[PDB]
Design a protein around this nucleic acid. Structure first.
Ligand SMILES: O=S([O-])[O-]
Lengths: 92, 107, 51
DNA sequence: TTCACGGAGGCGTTGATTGGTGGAT
DNA sequence: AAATCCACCAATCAACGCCTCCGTG
């Protein structure tokens, strides 16, 4: 376990922030670091909820449906229902 | 054009692009292996299906975008064109959906 | 007050993070890439260019 | 016994990491 | 006035995606 694996790469995060803003807009290094920490916790927060349900049902694999179910439980229902459409298309 | 009006229809535009786009699961803004390593940092997690990182790549794209747009509104209100950490902190306080980040972004 | 749907998971993550820091920003991540960037030919404006 | 599927490890890429300066603020 | 700090640039190498092989259920 490398300590730096808790976080997504900052350049990839920074690029998505850039595309979400006007062309003239600039982003402070602290805003990029803050966003990196927030989106990394988003993954861990949702994965932990999915993980505990997988363990309770004695399933070894966290699957796509577990992530969606965890997103609904934790009140990310826009994300759960949007990614459900995305998933069905990926399997279509 | 207004930062608020773009945010108020944000999910309509997400659903339009989901329902009518040439999704290339080939290309992702976020590397899948790194998403998987964040998941595996939790000792409770054993195995992960190939679909779970793919969902997180798209989910995290949407999440970074929504939060950046909410934060940009605060930057616009203070007549600044640089996005600051304080703009993200201000955005997090406006929705209880972000309560999970209370320890990541204190006060 | 706290999101009722997130309350329990927030505290599990706090304990898990407190445990993770126990068993583990630098100016840069890698010494080699740090040295590459300190070595390369720079333009007058401080930008890198093709070798 | 075969089928479905995800980890481990090897291979061929491959774009994230990186800092000095101008000028915006 | 004088200081702070982010976009700009592209080549190396840490690591990403894909593959094959094997273990599990
Ligand atoms: O109330 S929760 O933020 O600990």
């Amino acid at each position: 376990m490398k300590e730096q694996d808790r976080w997504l790469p900052i350049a990839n995060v920074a690029r998505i922030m850039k595309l979400a803003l006007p062309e003239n807009a600039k982003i402070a290094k602290e805003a990029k670091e803050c966003m990196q920490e927030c989106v990394s916790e988003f993954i861990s927060f949702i994965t932990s909820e999915a993980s505990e349900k997988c363990q309770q049902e004695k399933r070894k694999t966290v699957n796509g449906e577990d992530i969606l179910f965890a997103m609904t439980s934790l009140g990310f229902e826009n994300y759960a229902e949007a990614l459900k459409i995305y998933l069905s298309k990926y399997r279509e | 054009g207004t930062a608020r009006d773009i945010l108020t229809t944000y999910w309509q535009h997400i659903i339009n692009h989901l329902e009518s786009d040439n999704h290339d699961y080939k290309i992702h803004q976020l590397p899948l292996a790194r998403i998987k390593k964040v998941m595996k940092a939790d000792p409770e997690v054993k195995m992960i299906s190939a679909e779970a990182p793919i969902l997180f790549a798209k989910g995290c794209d949407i999440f970074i975008t929504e939060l950046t747009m909410r934060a940009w509104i605060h930057a616009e209100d203070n007549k600044r064109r640089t996005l600051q950490r304080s703009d993200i902190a201000a955005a997090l306080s406006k929705s209880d959906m972000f309560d999970f980040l209370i320890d990541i972004v204190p006060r | 007050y706290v999101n009722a749907k997130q309350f329990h998971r927030i505290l599990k993550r706090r304990v898990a993070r407190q445990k993770l820091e126990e068993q583990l920003r630098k100016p840069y991540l890698h010494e080699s890439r740090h040295n590459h960037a300190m070595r390369r030919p720079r333009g007058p404006g401080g930008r890198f260019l093709t070798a």
